User: Fold UDP-GALACTOSE-4-EPIMERASE from Escherichia coli.
Amino acid sequence: MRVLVTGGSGYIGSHTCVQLLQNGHDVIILDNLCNSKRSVLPVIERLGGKHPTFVEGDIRNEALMTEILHDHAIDTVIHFAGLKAVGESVQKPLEYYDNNVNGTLRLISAMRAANVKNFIFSSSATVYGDQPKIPYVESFPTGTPQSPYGKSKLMVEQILTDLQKAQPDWSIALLRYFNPVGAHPSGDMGEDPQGIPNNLMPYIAQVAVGRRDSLAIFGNDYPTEDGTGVRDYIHVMDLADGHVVAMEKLANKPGVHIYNLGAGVGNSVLDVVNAFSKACGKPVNYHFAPRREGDLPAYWADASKADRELNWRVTRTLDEMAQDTWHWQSRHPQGYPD
Amino acid sequence: MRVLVTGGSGYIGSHTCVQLLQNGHDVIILDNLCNSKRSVLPVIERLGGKHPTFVEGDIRNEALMTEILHDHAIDTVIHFAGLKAVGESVQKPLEYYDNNVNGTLRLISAMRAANVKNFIFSSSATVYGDQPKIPYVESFPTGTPQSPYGKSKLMVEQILTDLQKAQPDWSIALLRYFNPVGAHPSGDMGEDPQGIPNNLMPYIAQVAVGRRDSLAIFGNDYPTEDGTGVRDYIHVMDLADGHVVAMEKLANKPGVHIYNLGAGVGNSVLDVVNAFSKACGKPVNYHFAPRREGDLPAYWADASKADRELNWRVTRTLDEMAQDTWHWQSRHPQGYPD
Ligand SMILES: NC(=O)c1ccc[n+]([C@@H]2O[C@H](COP(=O)([O-])OP(=O)(O)OC[C@H]3O[C@@H](n4cnc5c(N)ncnc54)[C@H](O)[C@@H]3O)[C@@H](O)[C@H]2O)c1
Ligand SMILES: NC(=O)c1ccc[n+]([C@@H]2O[C@H](COP(=O)([O-])OP(=O)(O)OC[C@H]3O[C@@H](n4cnc5c(N)ncnc54)[C@H](O)[C@@H]3O)[C@@H](O)[C@H]2O)c1
Ligand SMILES: O=c1ccn([C@@H]2O[C@H](COP(=O)(O)OP(=O)(O)O[C@H]3O[C@H](CO)[C@@H](O)[C@H](O)[C@@H]3O)[C@@H](O)[C@H]2O)c(=O)[nH]1
Ligand SMILES: O=c1ccn([C@@H]2O[C@H](COP(=O)(O)OP(=O)(O)O[C@H]3O[C@H](CO)[C@@H](O)[C@H](O)[C@@H]3O)[C@@H](O)[C@H]2O)c(=O)[nH]1
Ligand code: NA
Ligand code: NA
Ligand code: NA
Ligand code: NA
Ligand code: NA
Ligand code: NA
Assistant:
């Protein structure tokens, strides 16, 4: 298939592009490079074994989106582009609503203009809100996310759902990600955050590489087995594969197809730290700090639906996630080159 | 004060502009004329007794909004511009999200750019969703509106709230309207819908003027006193006055000030019909049809908060609403001239 991958040079998108190319699809990447570098391009082509076309541009530019869609005879669009720092979203809400809500709106408006009707959206478990019932199931009603970022994802899901109702021939997948971690097994592609990493895995990796002192563990008084927060970590390669399958199986299948993409099990902060210490060959330094504002104690996905309907399930383990992260971190301590 | 009134040539905005001018404020109207005519301009100035500047343009045009704000040294913005047909929103969701969500976002982004920090937003009781508890109180958590239009209003309220949190010097009023009806007492300004009117009052008026056959009363089996739906109708002049007071009293008062603007009492469809028959001097023809998809049986506002905090309450009655509507309808059967 001919697929436009917005945000294709970013963390999740880069890995997904490699898997798509490996499956022989024709890939066009659209990215504004605000949170990624052109230096990943050659890696995607190498690892993917096929050349992906790259277009530098912004999803907010509807005219350009329309032109790309038409120009490349796109059949389906996988939408990863957006802003995603939770804390920053609190500080700079407008930028989040503009990039995520308006950005997706401009993109789907371009699709309508170009007669493209297959879409895959990067959603998040944040949409479940403060749900006491765990694991989270797609049949649960959504809640109210506590950050502008989380809200922006739920708003997009709603707009997409209304769009599908109005244009019933569309096939739209709402893929709710849990906690993406890991890196391509080659150790040559991975997450390359700029500045202070906000997520657990990269933070741990930077502590391990000797860039950071100690991992601050946000809270040790949670009602969990070891007192630390519990989450569903999913290897980026398993996520990538899930996108390829969703794209291939849902194309031209009208509806709003919602799937949680997670491992279906929870792991604590200590569990993750322990796995990383093992992977890097030295104890990861850490300390206990106060609970992070708004975090829940524990949640993970119920991934039965995707297994049943798409025959998809994760295959990489927690150790692999840690190992692959360390390999990338260690092989490319400065990330992608400028 | 220097106030930019978006959507100022529309139904509610025109009346509000007259009241503002009467209070000696400097008014700049911004409207794209998609649902109004320049012919109302002269009426606003005449009835307002002062000239309001008019700018033809779209709230989606951030650069233009910024320029206007600066150019006119605006102190506060009252935002009425947007799309508001419920049924159409179901059929054309994108247009609604673009005009309402992106439109407001572009406008407030322009405000930030121009250092304007006082805002008044046209919200709706639709934000309460399917709330069994009536009357509706501002302290109730919001619900889930059932149309793209309703959702778009709740999304905007959320974005505005996050914006205020991020820029705490802002003063933002979220004015939740119930059912605006009525017309200026002069009979020379009023609601001028194009095509089939979607709301009860104008529909009744068109039946009365002899344009329409019969009023279809959506449902007669509701658990209400007469079996017809019950709502909170508020005279557009009372609404107008509430906007002037909110603007004057909340300017420079940091926070998110939420107020329901309603009469605080419910009236049935029959009650409204009866009032209109009385006003026009002939029985209004009507019949019973099936319930309208998604309508609730009965709801009205709890307007105590606005009374207490702003010393505002409605003063026009249901008969006045009907009388004023008939006077306008009858004096200007073709509405505003092309
Ligand atoms: N990583 C996670 O923990 C997480 C959790 C849930 C959901 N998501 C979502 O998955 C998607 C991918 O996340 P990621 O971890 O790969 O992040 P990322 O920052 O690595 O990837 C996003 C990419 O989008 C690009 N981009 C940003 N705004 C753009 C715009 N307006 N126009 C064009 N390109 C633009 C960035 O330059 C970057 O390459 C995002 O939508 C994110 O919100 C990620
Ligand atoms: N009338 C009601 O029953 C009702 C109920 C709740 C809330 N509201 C809200 O109150 C506000 C006023 O409603 P109204 O009854 O006066 O409607 P209206 O249609 O008469 O007024 C809206 C005005 O906005 C203008 N406009 C529309 N899109 C625009 C854009 N992108 N840029 C610039 N101008 C634009 C239209 O030309 C029109 O003059 C709207 O936000 C509406 O959603 C009205
Ligand atoms: O320095 C750190 C970072 C994280 N944590 C803890 O580790 C867990 C995972 O934290 P992380 O920030 O990586 O993800 P979250 O589970 O809090 O958030 C998930 O959901 C939000 C949206 O709600 C996304 O933005 C994130 O990328 C992620 O998918 C949590 O228990 C957090 O308290 C620490 O103790 N120290
Ligand atoms: O031809 C008509 C029109 C309306 N009605 C009835 O009259 C009442 C008022 O209907 P209307 O459509 O005017 O307003 P609503 O109360 O249904 O909707 C209110 O809330 C929505 C948002 O949810 C706004 O868009 C509307 O302008 C209005 O403020 C309802 O019981 C409706 O069933 C009829 O019986 N026949
Ligand atoms: Na339709
Ligand atoms: Na960063
Ligand atoms: Na670097
Ligand atoms: Na802040
Ligand atoms: Na109309
Ligand atoms: Na007319």
